[PDB]
Each structure stands twice: as structure tokens, then as C-alpha cells.
Amino acid sequence: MKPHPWFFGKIPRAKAEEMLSKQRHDGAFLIRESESAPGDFSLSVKFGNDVQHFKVLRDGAGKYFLWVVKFNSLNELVDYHRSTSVSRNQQIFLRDIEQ
Numbered sequence: 104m105k106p107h108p109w110f111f112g113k114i115p116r117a118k119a120e121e122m123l124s125k126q127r128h129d130g131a132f133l134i135r136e137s138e139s140a141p142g143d144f145s146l147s148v149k150f151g152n153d154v155q156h157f158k159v160l161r162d163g164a165g166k167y168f169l170w171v172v173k174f175n176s177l178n179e180l181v182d183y184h185r186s187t188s189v190s191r192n193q194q195i196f197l198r199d200i201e202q
């Protein structure tokens with residue numbers, strides 16, 4: 104296997120916005136480690152001329168989620184959202200960032 108092209112570690116929210124706005128496709132994303140909420144993860148996605156941010160929420164079972172459906176890993180959250188939208192208003196499917 105190859106390492107996941109979506110994990111950026113502890114990068115600032117503004118830095119994530121700066122690089123995603125330059126990407127050419129809707130759905131281009133990254134997972135980053137939140138500075139505002141230490142220990143947690145955040146999802147940043149490009150759509151149109153904006154960059155949307157989602158908190159990767161945790162429960163007492165250690166599951167990962169954005170809305171209702173629970174996942175065992177960050178990898179499973181990401182993979183599910185490549186075929187199912189992260190939004191109910193717009194069709195936003197996650198796709199790998201271009202290097």
C-alpha cells in the first residue's frame with residue numbers, strides 16, 4: 104500500500120483553506136488534527152469557491168462520525184464519503200487532493 108494522501112497532521116485551519124481553494128475539483132479534501140480542539144480531527148473540503156469545515160465527532164465508544172452514521176475508523180469515514188455526500192443540500196463527494 105501507499106500512505107493516504109489526505110492526512111496532513113497538525114496544520115492550521117487557514118493553511119488548509121489556502122491550499123484547498125487552489126485545488127481544481129469539488130470534493131478535494133484533507134483530514135487535519137484540530138488546534139482549536141486538541142486531540143480531535145477535522146475535515147476540510149473544497150466546494151465551488153468555498154472551503155467547508157466539518158468536525159470529526161467522537162462518542163464514548165471511540166466511534167468517528169460527522170452526522171448520524173458511526174464509523175470504526177477515520178479511514179472508513181473517508182471511504183464511505185467518496186460515494187455518499189457529506190452534505191444534504193449539495194452533492195459533495197470526497198476525492199483525493201492533487202499533488
Ligand SMILES: CNC(=O)[C@H]1[C@H](C(=O)N[C@@H](CCC(N)=O)C(=O)N[C@@H](CC(N)=O)C(N)=O)[C@H]1c1ccc(OP(=O)(O)O)cc1
Pocket residue numbers: 116136137138139140145146155156157158159160168169170
Ligand atoms: C466557523 N464555524 C465552523 O467552522 C463550524 C463548522 C460547521 O458547522 N460546518 C457545517 C458543515 C459545513 C458547512 N455547512 O459549511 C456543519 O453543519 N457541521 C456540523 C456537522 C459536523 N460534523 O461538523 C456540526 N457543526 O456539527 C464547525 C467547525 C468548527 C470547528 C472545526 O474544527 P477547526 O476549529 O476548524 O479545527 C470544524 C468545523
